[model samples]
Target: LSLTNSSLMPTLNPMIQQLALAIAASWQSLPLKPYQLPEDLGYVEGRLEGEKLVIENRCYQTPQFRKMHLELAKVGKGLDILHCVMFPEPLYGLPLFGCDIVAGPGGVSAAIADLSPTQSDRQLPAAYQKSLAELGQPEFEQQRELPPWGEIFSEYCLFIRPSNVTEEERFVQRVVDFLQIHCHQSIVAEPLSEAQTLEHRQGQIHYCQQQQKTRRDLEKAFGEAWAERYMSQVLFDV
Candidate 1:
């Protein structure tokens, strides 16, 4: 019942919880009402290798978005992850918003945040490009490359490895900036033409499938079957 509050999880990493709280607060700011998820998926219990794995998912929805999902996972005491995405209602013609952080004993191994476009051109909307340009970029010690299936992401994506606490916090703040821009733009976004909306659906579907392909960690933690179910139902149901 208290899974929504990350503070209660004593074993969770502080930075991981902090990021989760940031995402939850951002979703709350949008006034997103709850989107009912599968009962078992809301709070998952599993075993990753010999260690216990806990996964919690919180979902919300608005007229503009089909599902706004925030997922927090802890694998043993060594690993904690925050995965979040805002899936637009296909007809709304809004960019997909996503961010993820993988933290381990060595600090943040990978942190990425982006507002990926859903158009045939694979470019963010003009307004989004302008706002993102105004925000500029944050300096980081390490930068990571996108995967082979990264064409779904926009040009403004931020992928980095934080070597220190200061950089970690900076990455969190940048994610908040992306979320804020996406929320504000979503509010004013209008539907596209019928044919364009169809195109948006295809783009969104392609994005989900590409994301699904990068489930190696998930598959290793659980089995392939469980990972497939979690990916399709909990993380990126389309």
Candidate 2:
């Protein structure tokens, strides 16, 4: 009966955090609380200080995922941003679970929820693509210049533009749906042989290296030193 996180603290979005926490409480034979990112990153801020980052996680092998590893903070000054990445153990070959909501006086600018694919050629089943698109067809092109990485992320993404309460509820339901998809993938996650496990290990390393290269605004907010340490230790968990 291991705890799910090192510390349980409030975050930018309690709803999303709590949802994952409940599910993590039911796993076995793994550390629920992962290594905390270095405090130097300024993970918490003026109002968000004392709040927890990871909601829940499970890991053992070289490429185990503790949780989605979400972080909430500001981009520049006035805006509130929520960014999370959940990439399960490579054995599962699951896409990253992602949600980035940036908002403030003008409301959310980049509202996205994605079960993202990896660098591998693995294609998501047609049924899944259709379902995901039906709910929220990520029209990322409509927005400003997209992130450098994950060129296909928007293609299979579930984009949400929730203006009012009703739309927000709709998007929330989609998040719930994402959880259902995640659980199902875990249950049916295939077993990798010794050789496959080795491949998985290399894949994780490749992902870590490639991801770090793309970049973020974290450097701007906290400076280069804090940003690099946080990403390596916390997000990738190498």
Candidate 3:
């Protein structure tokens, strides 16, 4: 999932379009299933609940829920070929469950660590676990603090299926690797200029908006055709 400030709403369309095109051109090579949801539930409005932004459940039929379930179905597959293309192991389940409840940046890592024995362990056999340990160290821990209000906004959600433990572990590891790499890259790349930070920040916002829009648009564009396609190609392939 991606994040961005709500203030960028007016200027984010082009970036959103570009991101969508990229995902469509590259990731779309894989067999994908799309999920549908009501438009009213497409965008989430968040409010500050003390330190963290609490996502108000104003809409019951959210695109977030739809995309989540779609991803859940994708992770359900065994021997996921996408894993071979993207990483070392098959990704089989939602790895972002209970993310909203995490109180801070460390909370995100703590939530993840709490969820998996592999992640919580000292020695990391899984590539993702090793990555998380590196990223969650004290220096990086300082970075997990939430940005000032209106500076940035983010939310996380985890997904799991009792039936797919082994595949879930593999998928969780991939998430760890992704997050670790991103954290390091963000710092090492040193996007220090105000313009650069704004650009980067705006890009994140656009991505989030696009992800929400895509889920809603795909639902409208393909309807049952999309659902059936994803179910067969991603969820039940195992």
Candidate 4:
């Protein structure tokens, strides 16, 4: 799977790395054994001995062995079911996002504050309000201004499953095509670029692991920056 977010490439790379590791570990533990079904035959028509019919039945030659086999088969089936349910074979080329938009000074804060209808000061800025009136109608006039290009940052993450190698290649090809057609960027296709692929995979693994292990640290890192940005801004007219 892959996830795309437009943000600083460097900051987003680590999170993608950690996710890759977690995904890889999860895939490694699946059971891949085949199951067998026992065949059953109808009751045989046989001769009568004394007063009862002596029927010949073809049963498992070794009942003990069959019983043990059945028991193991049950366990195996259970494990297989669990694996399937837990990791329902992800569609070959599905893209996933780890942390698309990290906290930023861009409209996020204003968006959050807008949720409180009880707040008496809840109103759009005069400049924005005027723009809305002039435009005849407000198009996102309630939204806060987006952070300046470099002023705001978010993490982008992408992941692809190991089983879907072909799909992964196609996904990359599509991305290249999109960039070329839209942005006029030229990128060469390199399916054998194991080094780069491994690097990205490892990075995703590490990013997810780190987030899981030190969630507080990760939250604090973003929180500190957000607080600084929030405190420095003057939202009200003096």
How high is the CA lDDT of each candidate model?
0.81, 0.51, 0.26, 0.21
- Please give the lDDT score at residue 189 for candidate 1: 88
**Candidate number achieving the greatest lDDT relative to the actual structure:** 1
lDDT of 1 by residue, 1-238 (tens): 2245653256556667777777776777775778998887887776767888787777889989999888878876678888889899988899998988887766778888888899898878888888888987799878888889896888778888887889888888888888888888888989889999999999988999888753676788777887888888888776
lDDT of 2 by residue, 1-238 (tens): 2333434324333433433343344333233454444444423432223332222222332234534455545433345555566656766566666666655555555567766654355455444566565665322333344466555463546565555545555555666677566655566556567676556556556656656651345565456775577677666655
Clashes of each: 0, 1, 7, 19
Best by TM-score: 1
RMSD of each: 2.1, 6.1, 19.0, 27.3
lDDT per residue as tens, model 4, 69-171: 0010001111100000010111111111111112121111111111001011233223323432443321222323323321111111122222233433333
On residues 67-151, what C-alpha lDDT tens digit does candidate 3 reach at each position?
A: 3221100111111111111111111211221111111111112112122111111222244345555544221212233323211
Query: Candidate 4: where is the Cα deviation over 4 Å?
Result: 1-163, 185-218, 222-224, 227-238
- Please rank every candidate by TM-score, starting with the best: 1, 2, 3, 4
Sorted on lDDT, highest at the top, how do the candidates line up? 1, 2, 3, 4
